[PDB]
Amino acid sequence: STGSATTTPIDSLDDAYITPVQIGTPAQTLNLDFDTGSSDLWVFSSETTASEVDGQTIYTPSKSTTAKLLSGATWSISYGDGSSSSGDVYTDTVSVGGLTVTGQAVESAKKVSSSFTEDSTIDGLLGLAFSTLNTVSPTQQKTFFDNAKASLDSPVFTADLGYHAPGTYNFGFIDTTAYTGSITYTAVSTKQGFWEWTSTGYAVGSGTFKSTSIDGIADTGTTLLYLPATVVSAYWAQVSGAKSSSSVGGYVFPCSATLPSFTFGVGSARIVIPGDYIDFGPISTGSSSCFGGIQSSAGIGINIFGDVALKAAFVVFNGATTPTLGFASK
């Protein structure tokens, strides 16, 4: 089997992407944030504290003929941005782009933090990291991908995120029309539960490539590219008027600037992030100061190849016995 679903930016900055997902019988369609940096599929629901729901579409398990409470199971998650959610657990039929999993754990939110309430466009998350990170207790549950895997034509999914435009998540096949050139594959460590890999270096604009190992994660659920302070300083030093602002919370630059590209290495291959992808717009409405899309990972504890990086590539998440990541230009 295979599945193919369009993913759409939630706003004009590509802060996140939402993908329609069918849950239950008859189908209830919710727009979920596919997150390769976590491993819980959780949704706003009929059980979510009413004051914490503001415009989201909710899952109502009592209206689904295929829903069943996983008795005694609970979940609780907190994300890198400090947001969180928690609740109880159902199993139900879940379909993404024509690919159906029966008995998928659907984590029903009883409580969500303010950032989720305030984002009317995201009805929940669909985690695509390794199932070892799943937060269900007492017995951890499998991700949608883990459950689908044995049914898939090939044990892969691909992320093809758009710059200010829709893109695609495919399951079970590689669309050879969706990228240019070849896909370069690189090793993955699952030791921390992430799609963790080692970039071979970077270049700033037309500069020479610096060969240096940068360990990080491929994370569709993070907006920006977070890299070591050395790398990030070298980038912004090439932008007139750029500086790190503690009051704003990162590097800022004059909105009139022309940003250099940023190249990262994947083995002997190279992915070029155009300068425009690094512009995240005014720091506040009407400001002539703009926020950078490449920021320091110092204090996160891990480097993160978030959407700024991933949307410059066609990315293969290979869930074979020995997992790997593939990157192609597009």
Indicate the length of the chain as a whole number.
330
Peptide bond into 138 cis (omega under 30): yes
Separation between Cα atoms, residue 116 and residue 132, nearest integer Å: 24
Contact 319, 145 (CB under 8 A): yes
- Helix (H) or strand (E) holding 273, with range, is strand 269-273
Q: Do both 118 and 62 map to the same domain?
A: yes
Q: What CA–CA distance (Å, rounded) separates 55 from 144?
A: 25
Q: CA-CA distance, 274 to 312, in Å (whole number)? A: 8
Separation between Cα atoms, residue 240 and residue 249, nearest integer Å: 19
Q: Whole-angstrom Cα distance, residue 187 to residue 46? A: 42
Q: Is 215 a catalytic residue?
A: no
253 and 265 inside one domain: yes
Nearest-angstrom CA–CA distance, 44 and 60: 9
Same domain, 95 and 152: yes
What residue numbers bound the domain in which 232 lies? 175-330
Q: For residue 143, give the amino acid letter.
A: T
Q: Are residues 125 and 49 in the same domain?
A: yes
324-328 vs 279-282, strand pairing mode:
unpaired
Q: Are residues 272 and 198 in the same domain?
A: yes
Report the run of H or E that residue 263 belongs to, with start and end: strand 262-266
Burial of 249 (C-beta count, 10 Å sphere; 0-12/13-18/19+)? exposed
Say which of 35, 146, 160, 279 is annotated catalytic: 35
Residues 199 and 277 in one domain: yes
Q: How far is it, in rounded angstroms, from Cα 258 to Cα 237?
A: 13
In angstroms, how far is CA 222 from the centroid of its own chain? 5
Residue ranges of alpha helices (H) inside the chain are 114-118, 144-148, 229-236, 307-310
Q: Where are the alpha helices (DSSP H) in 194-321?
A: 229-236, 307-310
Instruction: Please check whether residues 138 and 180 belong to one and the same domain.
Output: no
Beta bridge partners of 273: 262
**Cα 251 off chain centre by:** 22
Task: Please answer whether residues 294 and 235 qualify as being in contact, where contact means their C-beta atoms are separated by less than 8 angstroms.
Answer: yes
CATH number of the domain bearing residue 25: 2.40.70.10
β partners of residue 156: 318
Same domain (yes/no): 123, 239? no
Query: Residue 304 CB: number of other CB atoms within 10 A?
Result: 24
* Beta-bridge mates of residue 328: 314
For residues 286 and 210, membership in a common domain is answered with: yes
Structure tokens at 305: 């190849």
Catalytic residue among 199, 261, 296, 297: 199
Residue whose pair of structure tokens reads 């017995």 in the numeric block = 139
Domain boundary (174, 201, 234) is at: 174
Total number of domains constituting the chain: 2
139 and 164 inside one domain: yes
Is the peptide bond preceding residue 61 cis, with omega within 30 degrees of 0?
Answer: no
83 belongs to the catalytic site: no
- Beta strands 28-35 and 99-112 are unpaired
Last residue of a domain, one of 174, 195, 210: 174
Resolution limit in angstroms? Answer: 1.5
Give the end of a domain, one of 136, 151, 174: 174
39 and 169 part of one domain: yes
Q: Which candidate, 272, 266, 7, 33, places its Cα nearest to that of 162?
A: 7
Which SS3 state, helix, strand or coil, does residue 248 take? Answer: coil
Tell me which H or E stretch contains 94.
strand 84-96
User: Does 193 lie in the same domain as 144?
Assistant: no
d(CA 308, CA 312) in angstroms, rounded, equals 7
Task: Report DSSP letters for 36-76, one per residue.
Answer: TT---EEE-BTTS-GGG-SS---B-GGG-TT-EEEEEEEEE
Strand 314-318 relative to strand 303-305, pairing? unpaired
H or E stretch including 290?
A: strand 289-292
Largest CA distance in the chain: 60
Distance CA 293, CA 251 (A): 8
